[PDB]
Structure 1
């Protein structure tokens, strides 16, 4: 249905933003190893 797709998309957006933060967190740890 229509509303279930609205929510699916909102959930998808929040998952991608959480994965962007995890990526930023990993990049910080990598840069420490690469320059520390």
Structure 2
């Protein structure tokens, strides 16, 4: 249905934003190793 598509998109947007944060945290740890 239409409303179910709405909510699926919103969930995918939120999951991608959580993955962006998780990658930023990994990048921080990697850079500590790379320069230390």
In which range does the TM-score fall when normalised by the shorter chain? over 0.9
TM-score using structure 1 length: 0.99
Structure 1 segments, 4+ long, off by >2 Å, are: none
TM-score using structure 2 length: 0.99
Paired residues, number: 36
- Segments of 5+ residues of structure 2 without an aligned counterpart are none
RMSD: 0.2
